């Protein structure tokens, strides 16, 4: 899968936003891909890094982070105040067919839209 | 919200299977809320756990999928291999609702992109 521009649609709290993010090469040291949004400033852009390892079991890792900028008085250049992180990892094995991996991926993707998760994340209230 | 029966649709490689799972109590030691599927055998069980923390708020979600194979020269089945998953969110104290919702929706939508399905289903580097 060669890197290319990715356009996600129908996102946000109200479901009307969207973002376009384009590749930014691969790091030869650890073989991690990268993507970012063209935000006109290198330090205030959302970025995504995805990498899959090799064996004695495979491991896929996805990281998402995006900063928030605030222009405090007494200065001109914006800085970063807080950041929101994310992390996803998979631990499939050698003798696993693609059916099980696809099932796990679809289960995780559809579990992030159920009322339980959208209530436990947006409002940060523990489930009981 | 309190735990309740959760049904998932359009699950699977071809988008035709269906997974229904029901609550399985709350652990009082560390406050993880479990879920499980009525598979008639406790060992061959697909389980999901979700828990949030209190102070840098932390949200964790774990998915576990065991595979059952009929052991040779035995009656009861045994687990051979297992597939894991994990999600971790690390919002801060002053983070508003919109930022968290944006992160969650971005993670949900990005996981259906051709890049991720190629990287997971076929396990080939990008």
């Amino acid at each position, epitope marked *: 899968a060669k890197l290319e521009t990715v356009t996600l649609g129908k996102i946000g709290k109200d479901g*009307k936003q969207t973002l376009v993010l384009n590749p930014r090469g691969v790091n030869p040291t650890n073989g991690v891909a990268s993507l970012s949004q063209a935000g006109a400033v290198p330090a205030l852009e959302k970025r995504v890094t995805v990498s899959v390892s090799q064996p004695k079991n495979y491991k896929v890792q996805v990281k998402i982070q995006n900063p928030t900028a605030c222009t405090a008085n007494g200065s001109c250049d914006p800085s970063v105040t807080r950041q929101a992180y994310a992390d996803v990892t998979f631990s499939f094995t050698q003798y696993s067919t693609d059916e099980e991996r696809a099932f796990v991926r679809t289960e995780l993707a559809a579990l992030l839209a159920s009322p339980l998760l959208i209530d436990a994340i947006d409002q940060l209230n523990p489930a009981y | 919200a309190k735990l309740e029966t959760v049904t998932l649709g359009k699950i699977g490689k071809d988008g035709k299977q269906t997974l229904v799972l029901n609550p399985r109590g709350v652990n009082p030691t560390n406050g993880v809320a479990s879920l499980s599927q009525a598979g008639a055998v406790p060992a061959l069980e697909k389980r999901v756990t979700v828990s949030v923390s209190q102070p840098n708020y932390k949200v964790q979600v774990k998915i576990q999928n065991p595979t059952a194979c009929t052991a040779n020269g035995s009656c009861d089945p045994s687990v051979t291999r297992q597939a894991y998953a994990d999600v971790t969110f690390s919002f801060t104290q002053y983070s508003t609702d919109e930022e968290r919702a944006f992160v969650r929706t971005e993670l949900a939508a990005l996981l259906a992109s051709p*890049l991720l399905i190629d990287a997971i289903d076929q396990l080939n580097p990008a």
Partner: antibody, heavy 113, light 106 residues
Framework: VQLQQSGPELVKSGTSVKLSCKAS????????LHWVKQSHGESLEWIGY????????IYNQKFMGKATLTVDRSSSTAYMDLHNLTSADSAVYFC???????????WGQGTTL | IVMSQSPSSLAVSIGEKVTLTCKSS????????????LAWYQQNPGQSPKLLIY???TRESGVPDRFTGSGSGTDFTLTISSVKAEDLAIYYC????????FGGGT
């Protein structure tokens, strides 16, 4: 958010006119302010938009000659200019806003010419 | 991008399950995930129009359930569960990626 335009206008021959859109209740950080027009009766046409995250100087084809979009950030007022008036000064012009690539959320009433 | 539509006028009066069809000159599967970029507007003859459906299948908040939209790769349609007292006036369709472009009438 709600926005309203500023008054019908009546111009003669070919001169310059001032059309302004008063927007109150939202920030220009990510939204794009469009300038769709309807002409008269049937059909409607696009003109352009101003978005700080995409350049803010995008115009519809064959309209660069008779359009100019400027925005004052302090007063949160966006006003656009016309240069020649032969058939452009025909009927109502609209003012719209929305997300970066999403649909047009809310419109205000349009001034007639 | 020309956005052709149904003929200019219809003559449905009441109770009829009238449907409106539209055609596009280029596939609208712009997003990486399979999401369409159409939206349906209705405009009363007096004032500015309103938004009804976006993403070609999602109803906007504050709209009666009688409206329903379905979409495909390049052939979209809009079906209303019978026409009520106030469901008249012109209906428009729009695509909102790159260069937006309206087109058509009732």
């Amino acid at each position: 958010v709600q926005l309203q335009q500023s008054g019908p206008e009546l111009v003669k021959s070919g001169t310059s006119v001032k059309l302004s859109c008063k927007a109150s209740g939202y920030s220009f950080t990510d939204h794009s302010l469009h300038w769709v027009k309807q002409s008269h009766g049937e059909s409607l046409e696009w003109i352009g938009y101003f978005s700080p995250n995409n350049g803010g100087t995008i115009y519809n084809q064959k309209f660069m000659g008779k359009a100019t979009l400027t925005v004052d950030r302090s007063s949160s007022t966006a006003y656009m200019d016309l240069h020649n008036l032969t058939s452009a000064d025909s009927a109502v012009y609209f003012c719209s806003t929305g997300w970066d690539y999403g649909p047009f959320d809310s419109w205000g009433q349009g001034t007639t010419l | 991008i020309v956005m052709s539509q149904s003929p200019s006028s219809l003559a449905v009066s009441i109770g009829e399950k009238v449907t409106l069809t539209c055609k596009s000159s280029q596939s609208l599967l712009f997003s990486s995930n399979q999401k369409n970029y159409l939206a349906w507007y209705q405009q009363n003859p007096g004032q500015s129009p309103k938004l009804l459906i976006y993403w070609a299948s999602t109803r906007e908040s504050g709209v009666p359930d009688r409206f329903t939209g379905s979409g495909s790769g390049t052939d979209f349609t809009l079906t209303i569960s019978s026409v009520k007292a106030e469901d008249l006036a012109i209906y428009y369709c729009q695509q909102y990626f790159r260069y937006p472009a309206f087109g058509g009438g009732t």
